[PDB]
């Protein structure tokens, strides 16, 4: 087990035992963010400036066992330097193209289900019909509209409940689920999510974005429904109007 091995190797030398046995567990939230770098005021300029550098991006060290140094023609693909305050390596943007060129392949049967809320849009657009164009006045009133269908009638509490029961099962803590709808959602995701290798933060994020409701403040002139709003730039204008029924 690499876990207990690396633990024992940490608490075998100095400088690392006192930090682990002095820092309580309600304090690691602060020292996780202890950085010596600053959030940047001008990102566009820095991107344009850094793109002409030899080694502009950073990768995990495992690269040294997954990607060569010099490719078929002889262009360097990663460097031998460590980043500022981390154990990550500094790599060139040709390594991304390489990985996409001659790299390890996997399966993609779960990527549709984890990102269902996007593929809904994708195969709802290619099943819709058009009509005439009415060039006339456009009178708009500003209202509050739900910009997401809001899968369930629930709020944040039971949302975290179902998400922790589906993603982090052995650490839900104390409580159990109560009603039928949350159990149904739970078990559906239980079955259809088995044997997934996507990062659990990504699964939790997609389930939050797929399961909770968001509302905004927008100018409307036609119909007030949720499937219409996502196509709003295209249906209404200030002088014209396109007709559309999504599928």
């Amino acid at each position: 087990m690499e876990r207990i091995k690396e633990l024992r190797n940490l608490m075998s030398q100095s400088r690392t035992r006192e930090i682990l046995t002095k820092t309580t567990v309600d304090h690691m939230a602060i020292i996780k963010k202890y950085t010596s770098g600053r959030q940047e005021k001008n990102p566009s300029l820095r991107m344009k400036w850094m793109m002409a550098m030899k080694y502009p991006i950073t990768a995990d060290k495992r690269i040294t066992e997954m990607v060569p140094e010099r490719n078929e023609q002889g262009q360097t693909l990663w460097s031998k330097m460590s980043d500022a305050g981390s154990d990550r390596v500094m790599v060139s943007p040709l390594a991304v193209t390489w990985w996409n060129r001659n790299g390890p392949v996997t399966s993609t049967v779960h990527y549709p289900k984890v990102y269902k809320t996007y593929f809904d849009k994708v195969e709802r657009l290619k099943h819709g019909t058009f009509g005439p164009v009415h060039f006339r006045n456009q009178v708009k009133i500003r209202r509050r509209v739900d910009i997401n269908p809001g899968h369930a009638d629930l709020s944040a509490k039971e949302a975290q409940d179902v998400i922790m029961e589906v993603v982090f099962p052995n650490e839900v803590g104390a409580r159990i689920l109560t009603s039928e709808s949350q159990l149904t959602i739970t078990k559906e995701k239980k079955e259809e999510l088995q044997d997934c290798k996507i990062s659990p933060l990504m699964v939790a994020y997609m389930l939050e974005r797929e399961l909770v409701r968001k509302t905004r403040f927008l100018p409307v002139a036609g119909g007030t429904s949720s499937v219409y709003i996502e196509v709003l730039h295209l249906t209404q204008g200030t002088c014209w109007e396109q007709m559309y029924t999504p599928g």
Binding site: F135, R136, N137, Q138, G237, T238, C239, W240
Partner: peptide, 11 residues
């Protein structure tokens, strides 16, 4: 253009 093409109902 879009201002003149809304008092006539025509492009």
């Amino acid at each position: 253009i879009e201002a003149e093409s809304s008092v006539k109902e025509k492009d």
